[PDB]
Amino acid sequence: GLMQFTLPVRLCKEIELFHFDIGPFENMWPGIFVYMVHRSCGTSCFELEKLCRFIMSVKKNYRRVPYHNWKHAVTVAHCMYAILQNNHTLFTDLERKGLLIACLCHDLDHRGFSNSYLQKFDHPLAALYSTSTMEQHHFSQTVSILQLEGHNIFSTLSSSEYEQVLEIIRKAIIATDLALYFGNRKQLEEMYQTGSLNLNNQSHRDRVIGLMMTACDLCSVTKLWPVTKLTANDIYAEFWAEGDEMKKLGIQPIPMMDRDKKDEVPQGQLGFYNAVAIPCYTTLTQILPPTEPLLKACRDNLSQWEKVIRGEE
Ligand SMILES: Cn1ncc(C(=O)N2CCC2)c1C(=O)Nc1cccc(-c2nc3ccccc3o2)c1
Ligand SMILES: [Mg+2]
Ligand SMILES: [Zn+2]
Numbered sequence: 001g002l003m004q005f006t007l008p009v010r011l012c013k014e015i016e017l018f019h020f021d022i023g024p025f026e027n028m029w030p031g032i033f034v035y036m037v038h039r040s041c042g043t044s045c046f047e048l049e050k051l052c053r054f055i056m057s058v059k060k061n062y063r064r065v066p067y068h069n070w071k072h073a074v075t076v077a078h079c080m081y082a083i084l085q086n087n088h089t090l091f092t093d094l095e096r097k098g099l100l101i102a103c104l105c106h107d108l109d110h111r112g113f114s115n116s117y118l119q120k121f122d123h124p125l126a127a128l129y130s131t132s133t134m135e136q137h138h139f140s141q142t143v144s145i146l147q148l149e150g151h152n153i154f155s156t157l158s159s160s161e162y163e164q165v166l167e168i169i170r171k172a173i174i175a176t177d178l179a180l181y182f183g184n185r186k187q188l189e190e191m192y193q194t195g196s197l198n199l200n201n202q203s204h205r206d207r208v209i210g211l212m213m214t215a216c217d218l219c220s221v222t223k224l225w226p227v228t229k230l231t232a233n234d235i236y237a238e239f240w241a242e243g244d245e246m247k248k249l250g251i252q253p254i255p256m257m258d259r260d261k262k263d264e265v266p267q268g269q270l271g272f273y274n275a276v277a278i279p280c281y282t283t284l285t286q287i288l289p290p291t292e293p294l295l296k297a298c299r300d301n302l303s304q305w306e307k308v309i310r311g312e313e
Helices: 009-014 026-041 048-060 070-086 093-105 115-121 124-128 133-146 159-175 178-193 202-217 225-248 259-287 289-309
Strands: none
Touching: 026 048, 026 070, 026 093, 048 093, 048 133, 070 093, 070 202, 070 289, 093 133, 093 159, 093 202, 115 124, 115 133, 115 225, 124 133, 133 159, 159 178, 159 202, 178 202, 178 259, 202 259, 225 259, 225 289, 259 289
């Protein structure tokens, strides 16, 4: 009850910044996450014994893949923490509880393959969930872990509060389907420009939490250049393995996934920064002004990729 988590000085300060890197010491990631829940939500919102057991079960259900691993889960949760901390008064007690858990759980049991590859492979998950395949599975894995003995971190919520938090978590995890991001951002852009955006409209909140989820999920593009550049290696390690599996099924992969077209990576990052990242953090900064450091860091990284192309690195 009086058991406060404390970080070493440099972490205590740097963890409040959007561009914080959680570091290569795995055994500290759980304490980093509790620290973020305690400061974001209160030291009262979860039973520590249940939270710790929830976190360790969630960790055990991430796989040893190069990118969509336990470190991605905690990085994405840290990005959400930064947003919530910079937008204190805009979010309810339940949204703060739900969204950090959503971020930790958002890629549970990811095998390092896209929804596309599952569909072309004819994976059982593709038959069970026709759209947002992996994301309905991640949500499904989250409920499973929540139903383990001694793992219900929401035990002291009412029936209605419990259904609300699981609904926040479900929508939050589905929104990490980047196929859904494009229309969600276009609608938020229109609603912001015409002035119809209303944070008391529940369907409007849903959309704003969706864009935050996309923003946190993509947050490798908002780190310092060395973190961004080295995360891109892990991202492409998975992409190229998927490309290999596409060729094994008799299908030429898109160039993004073809390790033969490794040369085209820098131009591919430009496309992604221009088509996805910059629009995402632009719309997010318009709706939530204090998230502007994500946009600025993203722009800096775009400029760094332009320098790679111009043979300056
Ligand atoms: C940095 N980052 N962070 C998350 C993701 C992402 O999309 N994820 C889905 C699971 C994480 C990415 C990312 O880089 N996406 C991306 C998007 C569109 C195109 C390209 C691209 N690269 C190419 C290289 C050579 C030729 C053509 C190429 O096209 C790359
Ligand atoms: Mg995902
Ligand atoms: Zn993710």
